[PDB]
């Protein structure tokens, strides 16, 4: 599959929402994007799957764990994602 990395320059908001996680038995997925927000401008796309957040495998995190990891990011948000938006 096709992966990509983003390094969003703070401060937050980062301009996205997530769905999924361990507790939903589905991957962590970008579910929403603010138009002109930092994630959108970084070419993050709805449907893409979050693989890691600041180096850490996110693929087993609960939804709240992933959100907390993302909110703990000061300065820059680094994530690696898997493209799942090419239909």
UniProtKB/Swiss-Prot annotation:
Residues 2-83 form the PDZ domain. May play an important role in the heart development by scaffolding PKC to the Z-disk region. May play a role in the regulation of cardiomyocyte expansion. Isoforms lacking the LIM domains may negatively modulate the scaffolding activity of isoform 1. Overexpression promotes the development of heart hypertrophy. Contributes to the regulation of dendritic spine morphogenesis in neurons. May be required to restrain postsynaptic growth of excitatory synapses. Isoform 1, but not isoform 2, expression favors spine thinning and elongation. It is found in: Postsynaptic density; Presynapse; Postsynapse; Cytoplasm, Cytosol. Interacts with various PKC isoforms through the LIM domains. Interacts with actin and alpha-actinin through the PDZ domain. Interacts (via LIM domains) with SIPA1L1/SPAR; this interaction may occur preferentially with isoform 1. This is PDZ and LIM domain protein 5. The modification Phosphoserine is found at residue 2. It comes from the Eukaryota. Heart and skeletal muscle specific. Expression is commonly increased in the brain of patients with bipolar disorder, schizophrenia, and major depression. The chain holds residues 1 to 83 of 596 of the full protein. The modification N-acetylserine is found at residue 2.
């Amino acid at each position: 599959m096709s992966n990509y990395s983003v390094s969003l320059v703070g401060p937050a908001p980062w301009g996205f929402r997530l769905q999924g996680g361990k507790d939903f038995n589905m991957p962590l997925t970008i579910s929403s994007l603010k138009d002109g927000g930092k994630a959108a401008q970084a070419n993050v796309r709805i449907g893409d799957v979050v693989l890691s957040i600041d180096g850490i495998n996110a693929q087993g995190m609960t939804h709240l764990e992933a959100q907390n990891k993302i909110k703990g990011c000061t300065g820059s948000l680094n994530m690696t994602l898997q493209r799942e938006s090419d239909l």
